[PDB]
Amino acid sequence: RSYPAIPRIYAETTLNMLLKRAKKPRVHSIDEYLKDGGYQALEKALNMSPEEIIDWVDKSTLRGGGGAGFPTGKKWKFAVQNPGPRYFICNADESEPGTFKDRIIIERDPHLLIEGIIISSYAIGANEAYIYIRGEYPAGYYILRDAIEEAKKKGFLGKNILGSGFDLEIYVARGAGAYICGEETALIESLEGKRGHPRLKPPYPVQKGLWGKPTVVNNVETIANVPFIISMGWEEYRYIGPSDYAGPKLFPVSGKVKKPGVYELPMNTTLREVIFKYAGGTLGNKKVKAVFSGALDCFSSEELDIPMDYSPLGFGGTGTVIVLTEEDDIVEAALKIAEFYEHETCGQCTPCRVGCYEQANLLEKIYKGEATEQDWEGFDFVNRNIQPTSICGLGAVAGRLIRQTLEKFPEEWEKYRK
Amino acid sequence: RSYPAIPRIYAETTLNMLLKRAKKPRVHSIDEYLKDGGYQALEKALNMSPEEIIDWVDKSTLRGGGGAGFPTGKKWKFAVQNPGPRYFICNADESEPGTFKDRIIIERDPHLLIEGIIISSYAIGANEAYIYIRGEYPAGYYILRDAIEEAKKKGFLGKNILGSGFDLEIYVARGAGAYICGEETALIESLEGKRGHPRLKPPYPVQKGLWGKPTVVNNVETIANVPFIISMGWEEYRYIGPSDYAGPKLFPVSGKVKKPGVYELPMNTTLREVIFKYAGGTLGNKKVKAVFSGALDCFSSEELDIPMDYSPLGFGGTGTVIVLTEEDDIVEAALKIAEFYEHETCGQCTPCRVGCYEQANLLEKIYKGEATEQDWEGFDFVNRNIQPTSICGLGAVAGRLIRQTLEKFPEEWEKYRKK
Amino acid sequence: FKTEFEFPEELKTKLQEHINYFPKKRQAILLCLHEIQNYYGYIPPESLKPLADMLELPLNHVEGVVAFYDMFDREDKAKYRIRVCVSIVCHLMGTNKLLKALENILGIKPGEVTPDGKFKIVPVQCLGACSEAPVFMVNDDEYKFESEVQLNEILSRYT
Amino acid sequence: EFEFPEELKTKLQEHINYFPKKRQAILLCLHEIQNYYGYIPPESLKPLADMLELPLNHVEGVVAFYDMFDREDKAKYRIRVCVSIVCHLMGTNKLLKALENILGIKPGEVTPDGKFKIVPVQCLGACSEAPVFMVNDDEYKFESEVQLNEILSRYT
Ligand SMILES: NC(=O)C1=CN([C@@H]2O[C@H](COP(=O)(O)OP(=O)(O)OC[C@H]3O[C@@H](n4cnc5c(N)ncnc54)[C@H](O)[C@@H]3O)[C@@H](O)[C@H]2O)C=CC1
Ligand SMILES: NC(=O)C1=CN([C@@H]2O[C@H](COP(=O)(O)OP(=O)(O)OC[C@H]3O[C@@H](n4cnc5c(N)ncnc54)[C@H](O)[C@@H]3O)[C@@H](O)[C@H]2O)C=CC1
Ligand SMILES: Cc1cc2c(cc1C)N(C[C@H](O)[C@H](O)[C@H](O)COP(=O)(O)O)c1[nH]c(=O)[nH]c(=O)c1N2
């Protein structure tokens, strides 16, 4: 019955889909979910062929909400070209700074996620599925465990689900403090009971994943779309937002805004609109100085008119929007990003291992005003050289945001070199 | 964002409880309220049984601040002995002359009220609560609507509040000009979409109220105490002021004082102290002639050393203090009181209907020097004869203040009998 | 040319919102009437029949409610209602000075409307702001009267 | 000579039986152990390894890798304080200061009584509610010292 205490993150939707229930800050149990027509998409799905479901998800143009925006249908297609058995994994590791969109689905509308996992699993022929939830989401973990039992009792999980002949078990695994275990191959390693060490890709999981078998990894948000696609059909879904970047997307907005929280919006929304139209503008009506796209990118106040889509010029990513205003020290903020990568490199690759450490170590000296000229030159050098030989995206991006602050706010860095 | 213009009523406290935030004349939103430890009392309440909360409120000695001073915990106990469902009503009709204490809580610290409502509703098992706010408080209405939304967003209202299993929605209704809709049964009638006609009591609302179901009606100020009782505990609360009349009380002071406003004070404070120690004394340092306790009582300058408590010899009421000084015409002031009751009788009862009107009608003639002997004797008679057959407190009291002025200021009235 | 009265859609929507707010439709009667008065500057008598239908109440019920509650006005259209408190505290502290100043500025006394339909003076009982006596409202805005020059400046904000 | 008490051994066995393969339950098992003892006893690792049918080596490596597990300090209540960008921007330092005022400890330290340990952590995925902290499994936004004090008083 009782769960650990959760802060009641604000949530708003113009689309009333992913946040239809999760916009209210409490657990929605199966009866309330069923009352809203929940699990009818599953029933429909089980009356369809796996191939047909893949087809609909493909034609929906659904993309991954885990940050890379990879077409979900195409991913599934790849998996089913490979002999079974196959595995389905729901990625609930959500640990990138500023990003708290997935947890509100987990904690408030677990059946939406579960229903999505069951459909997705059926589509790719997986009889065994996993949720990997970070260990710092203990309430989400217990909520999911209880929801799964509820689903079992109403006959949505187990053997021969609703007479369909399809069997499914969903196991819930917990992380234990490593951001890198959100990387799909390191997640799989952790599920296999090992340290979270990414594997060289290719192969991609859909070719070789859990126990070496075809495995689809999708983010919570991605999977939560699937019931809607089956329910509405792909045509109506494609009618949501702009025709190319169609469908709902979640935007966790934090920092110097009046209304921090998660916003369910179409992807033609601009960054400026997220901040000023939806999130209520800035604290104290101060000027926006920068937006940090999690720990990935830094947008200046001259880049607010971009769409929140997966276009070349679009915001992309997980739609994470951290707002800094005119008073916030960019170098101090960059330090916090450096600290994050320092604390999360898994250490496999030498430039990443030493690079993330030295970036933080040197940047701290710069910040405290204890950096020699050599420390300055060294900082510049190491920021440009975390990436070489790296086998996953962390190494590839650990210097990216900080580099952007150096390019976009030179005058503020210059003052530190004094 | 933007609310209607409100006068900045002065507020002062020696206790720093009800007016801790409302002493500053602005809206305190949920973030400021949370910073001051707001909603922690709710969290504490939800881990107690309803019965325990009632017991605490009972033991606190909390009395209604709506005017009658009825023990709040006892009222709650009466409700919960009756089968559910039950309803909880916050009375924000505040329309008694001189009375403006409730509005500063509403308009400045809405979350204090809301928190009190949620705790009280939980205590009596009410899943639906109402605020009935008078129509002439539009700012309060908008402020409350927004505050309720803030509370919903933070998960203090809705279904399964903080995993407790307790459900609550608070609806905000607006009055539309009738003083009698502050009478608890006419208020309920109004909430049911009808005219504000009081019902015969008993039954009291706690037995039969909204839709005939057990209903607790409590005043704004009453409810605003509830978070403190839970937060501090009943024992520590009962340590405030005299042990027989414990806790903060709000005193709206107006008229011929230097510092008119709302004062939060313990109930052992005397009326003299309210005027002279707190409200800065009189305008022009003139002598006090009289204090009107709203439109209820008239105290003379010989009665200033009474306690502001609910004792037989105490000031009682809503603690409303209207000061008149030596040059203020008592008969003119009496006329205004008569005019008030004339304009507010709901007319259901015959002596109230015709008496409120005739009292005002004849007194106007007296004031204007146009009263016959018959009008004089008529006025005296009607003033003593508003109450018969009355089914609510308005008829019971419409002659009371005026009668007190006749007894306490005979020389002034006689000046008019000659005129 | 003359057709049955119909609520403009923007008003109808607002009314429907109030009716949907409480558990029972008929609880919304006063909020609906406030809404109608806000929109028209008074309660049109012809508005009551469709309002009654929306509340699923008899017309005479609605008419009796309108008659009972002093804030509602079926008689005079006015853009701005200047509600002047005529109760004990405001009387003591200078209601008569406020009324005089109002007459000087607007040329109207209590109960009257300016010829342009702009302002109506409405005498009301205690407004619950007695410490700031003498008190008046202009629609929802509420003020202490200080002086004619100060009043004139306040009224200039309503156009 | 170290052996788990039976009620814990039961729970560990439930985790090990939950996934298709025993070794998948390693992290659930270690959380359980840390919950039970208030840290990971070095001596606990050998028998755990036996129940997982894994080398001790493997188990030690996993404990070392995952930051949530603590082998050094017993603490009844772990106050995990977010030190990442958003919480820092919105007042992590005010929270830590308030914590020092109430508990008399800084990040990394345990109260003398072994009751509270302050653990600096990366983003807890609650950034809208910055600054964030957890007390064991419970998570909160920090509002003020008075507010923090009342929350902490709930843990005895
Ligand atoms: N949601 C969150 O909390 C977090 C999000 N991220 C995001 O992670 C991103 C980097 O992620 P990656 O997985 O390395 O991206 P990626 O581009 O390599 O792959 C994205 C997905 O598409 C699949 N894929 C790509 N090409 C494929 C192919 N040819 N055949 C089969 N499958 C293919 C991958 O297996 C993976 O599932 C960053 O953009 C960052 O924003 C990072 C941290 C946390
Ligand atoms: N705050 C303001 O603006 C105004 C305040 N008032 C005050 O109203 C007062 C009169 O109010 P009433 O409600 O008629 O007083 P009352 O003495 O009849 O009742 C007070 C409360 O106690 C309850 N109660 C009384 N006896 C009970 C019993 N046997 N069982 C259960 N509950 C019982 C009533 O239901 C009510 O809620 C006056 O003293 C006056 O000051 C009047 C007008 C406006
Ligand atoms: C360092 C690091 C960390 C993470 C990731 C990547 C990298 C490089 N990815 C992305 C992940 O590898 C993968 O692309 C997605 O889980 C695939 O799902 P979708 O296609 O987005 O539905 C990722 N994805 C996700 O769903 N949640 C997470 O917490 C993370 N964390």
Ligand SMILES: Cc1cc2c(cc1C)N(C[C@H](O)[C@H](O)[C@H](O)COP(=O)(O)O)c1[nH]c(=O)[nH]c(=O)c1N2
């Ligand atoms: C004519 C008339 C008018 C009013 C009242 C009475 C009468 C006779 N009462 C008192 C009301 O009926 C009831 O006693 C209280 O609302 C109960 O709350 P408390 O016990 O004081 O918290 C009253 N109470 C209140 O809280 N606000 C008000 O505006 C009024 N108005």
Ligand code: SF4
């Ligand atoms: S790039 Fe960094 S985080 Fe990724 S596998 Fe290599 S060392 Fe580990």
Ligand code: SF4
């Ligand atoms: S006493 Fe007067 S106000 Fe009360 S119900 Fe009777 S007529 Fe109405």
Ligand code: FES
């Ligand atoms: S007497 Fe005028 S506001 Fe009270």
Ligand code: FES
């Ligand atoms: S930065 Fe602290 S919770 Fe995200």
Ligand SMILES: [Cl-]
């Ligand atoms: Cl009819």
Ligand SMILES: [Cl-]
């Ligand atoms: Cl071994």
Ligand code: NA
């Ligand atoms: Na949540």
Ligand code: NA
């Ligand atoms: Na993790």
Ligand code: NA
């Ligand atoms: Na006020």
Ligand code: NA
């Ligand atoms: Na009223």
Ligand code: NA
């Ligand atoms: Na009662």
Ligand code: NA
């Ligand atoms: Na006493």
